[model samples]
Target chain A: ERVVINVSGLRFETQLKTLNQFPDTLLGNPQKRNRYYDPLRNEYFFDRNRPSFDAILYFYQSGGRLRRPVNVPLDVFSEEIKFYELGENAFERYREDEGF
Target chain B: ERVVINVSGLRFETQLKTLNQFPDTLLGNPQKRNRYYDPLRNEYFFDRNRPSFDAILYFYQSGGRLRRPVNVPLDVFSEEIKFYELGENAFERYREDEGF
Candidate 1:
């Protein structure tokens, strides 16, 4: 019911059902996310911007909200959003929310 | 440099240095926090209020601020602050902030 994700050593925990909400996104898409699994560490590993991932993960748990972490640059989070493949709908919504 | 803490199955990640700042606290003290370690899972575990822990950990990371998560009850957070043993200084400071 829970999933452990490691984004460059920083870990985040959330429920599977939360990720399942958007099955098209990388985290929500089980098959897409498995490639980064760290079997010995017992978590999915992503060597991405540690700061950006929190808000990215929060995007899933929050069901639609996307906010850039204060310290994460605008384009970094945008790139992360692209990397996660949140799809055009969520992407469009995020851009609108950021007023970009 | 990082530690993985699982509070009742919800994982949280932070720096060893962050927890080290307040060694007298549960997470800050290695031996004290080790009792809850899930060696197989490779993370320390605690069965506690999930929402409360976020702000609890934030207290450490923020170096002082201890705001109760909006959804968490006031007294429940009080108990968690006690359980983590942030000690008298933080406890007194928290009470003052909450106007307890």
Candidate 2:
């Protein structure tokens, strides 16, 4: 089934399978132990940085590398990546390539 | 060089090579003849649908299949795919699988 994720003002709709791609991470965890699900809105709520969430969302959808938004600091972006449990190799490349 | 693309309020930062993945499309076309380049902001502006642009941007990064955002209408999403010149096969699959 497709799941709706409301990250503050930003919203995203994707498959539940995609959300489960990261295993024990926030969106992953099929057990739904840590993530909050809203029955009224039928959406998942995450108190996360909206701009950084964009990259995290795309990481699941694309199943590969990600590009950090220019406005977001590399350190903050890296933190979000870690929170989402996305691999660190991509962040390493981002730091060196962008001279972070 | 890395490029910043502002699609409405959603911003994406990616490599020029990634943007050039699909030739003759909005983000492709290295000639800089079709897409608008903003020297002042040092970014590219594409007055496109933000939701659809997310999928389009991922296509460039992952170089693979794309998943349509659940909220976006299939027809509209297909149109954006056409505009990006991504490919027809993926849309056909989406319509068949999603019953669109």
Candidate 3:
């Protein structure tokens, strides 16, 4: 199934399998996000940073690639990453992808 | 409200206002896509080429910027662009962006 995620006022969509790739992340684990579900809309909603949310979704789509949006503060992006639970391993993968 | 579109099982999300930007397109006109509505899922579904559909959604998201995926053939991508109803205007914008 394709999952719809609403961050602030923006919406994002991806496959359940894509989110399943990182079972450790909040989005990957369906049970973890059940609290955010909007039954009326049939989508999950998050009142979170919009730009940061895009990178988080892209992290899943890019197989853990994490690029902070220029407009987003580094600390804010890091905090959002932590909130999503991608943690150290995902960050390391992103660093390697960036050739850091 | 944010709109969710399912293309050959892959999902995409965007705002109603985004689609409203180009009402001449399939996605931009609500009445035009009524047949695609999946009431149970609360989303619109299309049985189309997944890669091509991505570019179509990106077109609206980027304010008419069009790009074709490398894996998709010129013919197939062009067909998809036509199918989405973006037509000449959006293509010209993409061509300009590519310095064509």
Candidate 4:
């Protein structure tokens, strides 16, 4: 279910750029994960701990483009959020629709 | 465990345009989530079913940018993925290093 995304809108701004370059460093450890039920030490304690690696998956797009393993590091965790494909045909239709 | 990501490199093709503008439709159901343990109906059966929402989160970077809810729909589930923060001090150092 892992996929690789080309971050198209990252802040190249000096401040944000520093934050953008570190997803690989943290994704290597699954024990460090936090879901909505578990917080990875940064989210508010009152918030669901779902902040772990599993819960964190809820934030990204899982299909399309080049699909790959989901390895995240602590530095750029925010860029990790994503989603998935609706169906197999959806991507095919998406490709055709996109003229790919 | 939701974060709003500004898509960085979406295709501008006319056919693909139809798919890019509909994220709001899918994320409203939990039964729709497919982690690495559960396949979301379209993935290969030979793969881990952990492909549900939880495993989906592993594909994202959990700590930078603006954060929001992780809602996915059949049409746009591939966009969901994510990770988490290290010690709060790490992010603080990250912010400081980035001058954020």
Candidate 5:
């Protein structure tokens, strides 16, 4: 039996949200569910209802049985690289072989 | 026969008033005139009325007997790399093939 480890911050606001299990929005998008000023009424109605103002991490709810061990291919360790800088006509870079 | 390699560096007063070769009024321009220079003098001159710069490369002045080999395309092999850092969270990057 493999157990999943989830690390989370311990704070009252976060705990409260977690307790109620608030929904999550997509990445980089903020939640906006205000009921205060209804444009349909063109005036102040109640108040604004928004999502968690703080961040949440590793808050799994279910599904996905996690990954199991497996062997990867063996040709993943053999190569060289070259680097070049971009600026003035200065191609001022030397090769390790250039030290020759 | 194919042989043309010239690299020279000797000091002379740059022998002529070329718009401040000492300051190189250009950003990354080495030196103009692949041959040398001469110009009607203005407030600034290409060189103090003459071409005394000693920048002679494999200077050719014959029927132009030269030969250059063309480069051929090449195939190369490469290696793969994976990393798991602070935020990358890559799948565990270790294996069990021990070699002490």
Candidate 6:
């Protein structure tokens, strides 16, 4: 079934499958009421960094590396990653490695 | 000064110059408090479609034709463009006109 998420005040319309991509995570856990249920909006209400959440959503949509925007500071984006429980590899994708 | 806009839950970090491109709109209005001010977040809050706002932000950044994404429905995206007061030309760009 399709689910509409109200993060802070932003609304994101997606499906349950997309949210379940990262197993054991907030939105991924169907059994968890805090992450999955919101009586007021009848949708999930996750009050987090909106822009960072956008970047996080991409992971679910593409099932790929997290492509962090340049404007978003590394520290700030890192915090959001931790909140989402996206894992080590997900964190590594945004890191700047020394190629030179 | 750079402006950080929180649309619903999505946070968009852009400059006033970019928001002012479409003059007389919500974000563009310097004189109006409602359009420009948010005492709590200390950032502008325009409770609109986050995905659609992402598309709208591109126009401010590029100052070019509005390139609507395939995932966003035409009618929904069109409503966002109208809310931003992007004008008739902007609307025409999204319309499917036959070359033949």
Highest TM-score among the candidates is held by which one? 1
As for candidate 3, its interface RMSD to one decimal place is 8.2
DockQ of each: 0.09, 0.05, 0.03, 0.02, 0.01, 0.06
What are the runs in model 6 whose C-alpha is more than 4 Å off?
A: A1-100, B31-33, B96-100
**Cand. 6 Cα-lDDT:** 0.66
Q: List the residue pairs that clash in candidate 2.
A: none
CAPRI tier of model 1: incorrect
Checking candidate 5 for backbone clashes, the offending pairs are A36-A47, B16-B48, B17-B48
* Standalone chain B TM-score for every prediction: 0.93, 0.77, 0.86, 0.20, 0.14, 0.80
Fnat measured on candidate 6:
0.04
Q: Encode model 5's per-residue lDDT on B33-79: one tens digit a residue.
A: 32322232111111110011122110122111111111100100000
Best of the candidates, lDDT = 1
- List fnat, each candidate: 0.04, 0.00, 0.00, 0.00, 0.00, 0.04
- Tens digits of per-residue lDDT for model 3, A13-44: 99998889888888888789888898988989
How many pairs of residues collide in each model? 1, 0, 0, 92, 3, 4
- Give the per-residue lDDT of model 1 (tens digit) for A2-100: 678887777677667888898999988879998888899879999888868756776675576666665667888899999999889988887887877
Candidate 4 lDDT for residue A3: 23
Instruction: Return the TM-score for each candidate structure.
Output: 0.55, 0.48, 0.52, 0.17, 0.12, 0.48
Ranking by lDDT: 1, 3, 2, 6, 4, 5
Ranking under DockQ, best-scoring first?
1, 6, 2, 3, 4, 5
- Name the docking class for model 2: incorrect
What value does the lDDT take at residue B41 in candidate 5?
Answer: 13
Preferred candidate (TM-score higher): 3 or 6: 3
Q: Tens-digit lDDT track for model 6 on B1-100?
A: 7888766545779887777877765456676525545786687765444566777888778885577765454555676778777777766776653121
Candidate with top DockQ is: 1
List ranges where model 2 is wrong by over 4 Å.
Answer: A32-34, B1-83, B86-100
The sequence of per-residue lDDT tens digits that candidate 3 reaches over residues B6-100 is 88877677678878889888888888877789999998998889867655765675566566665677778777888778968777765665455
Off by over 4 Å in 4: A1-71, A76-100, B1-23, B29-48, B55-100
Candidate 2: residue B80 Cα off by (Å) = 8.7
DockQ of 3: 0.03
How do the residues B1-100 of candidate 2 rate in per-residue lDDT, one tens digit apiece? 8888865435688888887777756567866523566675677765445567777888778875577876455655676787666656766766687775
